[PDB]
Design an enzyme around this catalytic site. Structure first.
Site, PDB file in Angstrom:
ATOM      1  N   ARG A 149       1.196  -1.485   0.119  1.00 50.66           N
ATOM      2  CA  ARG A 149       0.159   0.142  -0.411  1.00 50.66           C
ATOM      3  C   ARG A 149       0.904   1.266   0.106  1.00 50.66           C
ATOM      4  NH1 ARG A 149      -0.189  -1.979   4.345  1.00 50.66           N
ATOM      5  NH2 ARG A 149       0.917  -1.241   6.693  1.00 50.66           N
ATOM      6  N   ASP A 163       5.467   6.260   1.360  1.00 52.31           N
ATOM      7  CA  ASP A 163       4.558   6.382   2.970  1.00 52.31           C
ATOM      8  C   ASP A 163       3.707   7.221   3.268  1.00 52.31           C
ATOM      9  OD1 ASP A 163       3.842   5.954   5.253  1.00 52.31           O
ATOM     10  OD2 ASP A 163       5.729   6.343   7.154  1.00 52.31           O
TER      11      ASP A 163
HETATM   12  C1  LIG Z   1       2.592  14.395  -2.118  1.00 51.92           C
HETATM   13  C2  LIG Z   1       3.723  13.831  -1.749  1.00 51.92           C
HETATM   14  C3  LIG Z   1       4.313  13.720  -0.519  1.00 51.92           C
HETATM   15  C4  LIG Z   1       5.024  13.333   0.326  1.00 51.92           C
HETATM   16  C5  LIG Z   1       5.445  11.839   0.064  1.00 51.92           C
HETATM   17  N1  LIG Z   1       6.453  11.887   0.911  1.00 51.92           N
HETATM   18  C6  LIG Z   1       6.488  10.699   1.397  1.00 51.92           C
HETATM   19  O1  LIG Z   1       5.543   9.456   1.067  1.00 51.92           O
HETATM   20  C7  LIG Z   1       7.428  10.263   1.932  1.00 51.92           C
HETATM   21  C8  LIG Z   1       8.788   9.762   1.404  1.00 51.92           C
HETATM   22  C9  LIG Z   1       9.869   9.917   2.650  1.00 51.92           C
HETATM   23  C10 LIG Z   1      10.067   9.617   3.918  1.00 51.92           C
HETATM   24  C11 LIG Z   1      11.080   9.933   4.956  1.00 51.92           C
HETATM   25  N2  LIG Z   1      11.199   8.296   5.743  1.00 51.92           N
HETATM   26  C12 LIG Z   1      11.365   8.375   6.908  1.00 51.92           C
HETATM   27  C13 LIG Z   1      10.612   8.828   7.981  1.00 51.92           C
HETATM   28  N3  LIG Z   1       9.604   8.041   8.220  1.00 51.92           N
HETATM   29  C14 LIG Z   1      10.419   7.089   8.797  1.00 51.92           C
HETATM   30  C15 LIG Z   1       7.778   8.107   8.583  1.00 51.92           C
HETATM   31  C16 LIG Z   1      11.014   7.026   5.007  1.00 51.92           C
HETATM   32  O2  LIG Z   1      11.048   6.434   5.589  1.00 51.92           O
HETATM   33  C17 LIG Z   1      10.758   7.203   3.423  1.00 51.92           C
HETATM   34  C18 LIG Z   1      11.415   7.396   2.647  1.00 51.92           C
HETATM   35  C19 LIG Z   1      11.645   7.410   1.560  1.00 51.92           C
HETATM   36  C20 LIG Z   1      10.246   7.136   0.760  1.00 51.92           C
HETATM   37  N4  LIG Z   1       9.541   6.354   2.089  1.00 51.92           N
HETATM   38  C21 LIG Z   1       8.893   6.327   3.150  1.00 51.92           C
HETATM   39  C22 LIG Z   1       8.147   9.155   3.862  1.00 51.92           C
HETATM   40  C23 LIG Z   1       7.503   9.753   3.266  1.00 51.92           C
HETATM   41  C24 LIG Z   1       5.049  11.713  -1.038  1.00 51.92           C
HETATM   42  C25 LIG Z   1       3.969  12.322  -1.717  1.00 51.92           C
HETATM   43  N5  LIG Z   1       3.183  11.721  -2.970  1.00 51.92           N
HETATM   44  C26 LIG Z   1       2.456  10.760  -2.764  1.00 51.92           C
HETATM   45  N6  LIG Z   1       2.244  10.405  -1.693  1.00 51.92           N
HETATM   46  C27 LIG Z   1       1.274   9.643  -1.101  1.00 51.92           C
HETATM   47  C28 LIG Z   1       0.640   8.778  -2.595  1.00 51.92           C
HETATM   48  C29 LIG Z   1       1.260   9.695  -3.926  1.00 51.92           C
HETATM   49  C30 LIG Z   1       0.248   8.959  -5.410  1.00 51.92           C
HETATM   50  C31 LIG Z   1      -0.944   9.133  -5.214  1.00 51.92           C
HETATM   51  C32 LIG Z   1      -1.775   8.029  -6.152  1.00 51.92           C
HETATM   52  C33 LIG Z   1      -1.125   8.474  -7.374  1.00 51.92           C
HETATM   53  N7  LIG Z   1      -0.144   9.652  -7.270  1.00 51.92           N
HETATM   54  C34 LIG Z   1       0.632   9.413  -6.067  1.00 51.92           C
HETATM   55  N8  LIG Z   1       1.303  10.411  -4.055  1.00 51.92           N
END
Ligand SMILES: Cc1ccc(NC(=O)c2ccc(CN(CCN(C)C)C(=O)c3cccnc3)cc2)cc1Nc1nccc(-c2cccnc2)n1
Ligand SMILES: [Cl-]
Ligand SMILES: [Cl-]
Ligand SMILES: [Cl-]
Length: 285
Positions: A149, A163
């Site tokens: 998810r 996330d």
């Molecule tokens: C806009 C938007 C804004 C912000 C984000 N940022 C993140 O999701 C995010 C990035 C970094 C981190 C950092 N951390 C450490 C912290 N955690 C331990 C807590 C990770 O472990 C990590 C690192 C790297 C990746 N994942 C996890 C946490 C969350 C995504 C989206 N885009 C986004 N989000 C949801 C859906 C869609 C969507 C849906 C349908 C179609 N098209 C698009 N696009």
């Protein structure tokens, strides 16, 4: 900040996910792309219900995203609006949405190709997730909620780890179980996270194995038909593990088993997982 994008350069769209204090919406960005004057993006923001803990958390997420830098298999930061307004984080938009619903959509036409998904696609998703997690591990970034998810799929079948965080309604989602003051993704959690509150890259490796079970069941629910209750916890402790899903090869299942070692240090690294899965790819890849 160089990441700063004018708020008036955005036109906000349909909601892609929401939770109690946050949400993500589709949007159009003008003058953000250097090659495209108008582009579709995804924007994360808070709801009016949000308190300081949430605002702080969203700013912290933006900071981590900038610090990590880009990777092909991590959802790509494009900009942010942090001044003179509520905070927005802007990323690429991924055409196919989340991996769970995409797999479900693809069940009827599974072929094992324009006609449907194959084992090659499943292995490709498996490989790309490992590469994305290898990148995060290399930056000492522990995900803590790795699951299908939280994998998006872009138009070229490119995996993007994310996330949803505050933009997922964990309080009203059967994948998250109440265990304290919050809801936790117990069926994806390593035993040491469940029982010892220990989160490491090695517990992400356990979750990766569960995610592979999701991929090779075409979006099945882990431990299908099992409630998270005292019997579940005892089963995990006693060494119970899921059996091989129907579309997994024996090599893929061996990998999941390795990821579910009771001892965290015995689980394989995401570097080795990436290399092993790549070696399983057939010639035409
Ligand atoms: C806009 C938007 C804004 C912000 C984000 N940022 C993140 O999701 C995010 C990035 C970094 C981190 C950092 N951390 C450490 C912290 N955690 C331990 C807590 C990770 O472990 C990590 C690192 C790297 C990746 N994942 C996890 C946490 C969350 C995504 C989206 N885009 C986004 N989000 C949801 C859906 C869609 C969507 C849906 C349908 C179609 N098209 C698009 N696009
Ligand atoms: Cl579209
Ligand atoms: Cl417990
Ligand atoms: Cl299955």
């Amino acid at each position: 900040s160089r990441w700063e994008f004018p708020r008036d350069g955005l036109v906000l769209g349909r909601v892609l996910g929401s939770g109690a204090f946050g949400k993500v919406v589709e949007g159009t960005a003008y003058g953000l792309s250097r090659s495209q004057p108008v582009m579709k993006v995804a924007v994360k923001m808070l709801k009016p219900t949000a308190r300081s803990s949430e605002k702080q958390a969203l700013m912290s997420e933006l900071k981590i995203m900038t610090h990590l830098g880009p990777h092909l298999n991590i959802v790509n930061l494009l900009g942010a609006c942090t001044k003179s307004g509520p905070i927005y984080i802007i990323t690429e938009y991924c055409f196919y949405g989340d991996l769970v619903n995409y797999l479900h959509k693809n069940r009827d036409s599974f072929l094992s190709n324009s006609e449907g998904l194959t084992l090659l696609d499943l292995l490709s998703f498996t490989y790309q997730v490992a590469r994305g997690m290898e990148f995060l591990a290399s930056k000492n970034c522990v995900h803590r909620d790795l699951a299908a998810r939280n994998v998006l799929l872009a138009q070229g079948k490119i995996v993007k780890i994310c996330d949803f965080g505050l933009a997922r309604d964990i309080m009203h989602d059967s994948n998250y179980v109440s265990k304290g003051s919050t809801f936790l993704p117990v069926k994806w959690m390593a035993p040491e996270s469940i029982f010892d509150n220990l989160y490491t890259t090695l517990s992400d490796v356990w979750s990766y194995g569960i995610l592979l079970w999701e991929i090779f069941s075409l979006g099945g629910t882990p431990y299908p038909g099992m409630m998270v209750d005292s019997t579940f916890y005892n089963k995990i402790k006693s060494g119970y593990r899921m059996a091989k899903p129907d579309h997994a090869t024996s090599e893929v299942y061996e990998i999941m088993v390795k990821c579910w070692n009771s001892e965290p240090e015995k689980r394989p690294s995401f570097y080795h997982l990436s290399e092993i899965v790549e070696n399983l790819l057939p010639g035409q890849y």
